[PDB]
């Protein structure tokens, strides 16, 4: 009912959601009563085999992930899909005995929706875990910006810069590809804008830090001024990174 929130999810489930709607258009909403559905044992046994596989691949993920939220949230989706499968199977049987069975049609619709819905939940949960990984990179840059305060040597500054360079570059790549995958254009705009702002402030931060280190070890002058520009750049960067974290979590 909502737009699938990534392009991958949309290309997987969008075909299925449409087919389900076409099935409903007939049969249910009071319309094509008394039609006659053929034997569905074949196509249901194939869904059943795909359900098995999905649950296989999923239970390997669960016992293998570090993500504790993932570990908890996947199992319910497995239940929803197996339970929806169980109706599809009862529908195959019911239609074998009566091609005109109306409970068989209701089960078939409910079942199909349950497969869609449970597979949607399984993919969302998985996606959420991928997003938390990007948020891990973001919070580590945030933590590290907190430590710009304690840099006072040129040697400190160059270590700070060596360790910050990879973090920023990994983040930039992650947000770039994430943004591409999104299906809400306004969410891409925010991530690109916030990111572009962080990127452009990075060299300003380093220049601000050079300035503060240099004014400090020339042993006096406008140190209070150099201090509040470095601080502003860190508050402004941390603000954007936080905005990035918030917007990544939208769906």
């Amino acid at each position: 009912m909502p737009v699938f929130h990534t392009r991958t999810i949309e290309s997987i489930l969008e075909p299925v959601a449409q087919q389900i709607s076409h099935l409903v258009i007939m049969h249910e909403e009071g319309e094509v009563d008394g039609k006659a559905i053929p034997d569905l044992t074949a196509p249901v046994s194939a869904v059943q085999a795909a359900v098995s596989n999905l649950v296989r691949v999923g239970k390997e993920t669960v016992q293998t992930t570090e993500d504790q939220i993932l570990k908890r949230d996947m199992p319910p989706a497995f239940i929803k899909v197996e339970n929806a499968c169980t109706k599809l199977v009862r529908a195959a049987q019911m239609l074998q005995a009566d091609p005109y069975s109306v409970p068989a049609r209701d089960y078939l619709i409910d079942g199909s929706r349950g497969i869609l819905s449970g597979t949607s939940d399984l993919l969302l949960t998985f996606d959420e875990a991928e997003v938390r990984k990007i948020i891990r990179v973001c919070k580590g840059i945030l933590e590290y910006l907190t430590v710009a305060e304690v840099v006072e040597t040129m040697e400190d500054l160059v270590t700070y810069t060596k360790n910050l360079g990879p973090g920023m570059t990994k983040m930039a790549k992650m947000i770039d590809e994430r943004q591409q995958e999104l299906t809400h254009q306004e969410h891409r705009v925010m991530l690109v804008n916030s990111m572009n702002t962080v990127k452009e402030l990075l060299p300003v931060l380093i220049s601000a830090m050079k300035i503060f280190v240099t004014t400090k070890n020339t042993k006096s002058q406008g140190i209070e001024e150099a201090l509040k520009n470095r601080n502003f750049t860190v508050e402004k960067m941390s603000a954007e990174i936080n905005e990035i974290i918030r917007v990544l979590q939208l769906t």
Partner: peptide
């Protein structure tokens, strides 16, 4: 789960195609 989910989608769409054949 991407290949697992593609396969369940392909299987379900095909089921749902055979229920209007």
């Amino acid at each position: 789960i991407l290949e697992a989910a593609k396969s369940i989608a392909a299987a379900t769409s095909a089921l749902v195609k055979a229920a209007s054949a």
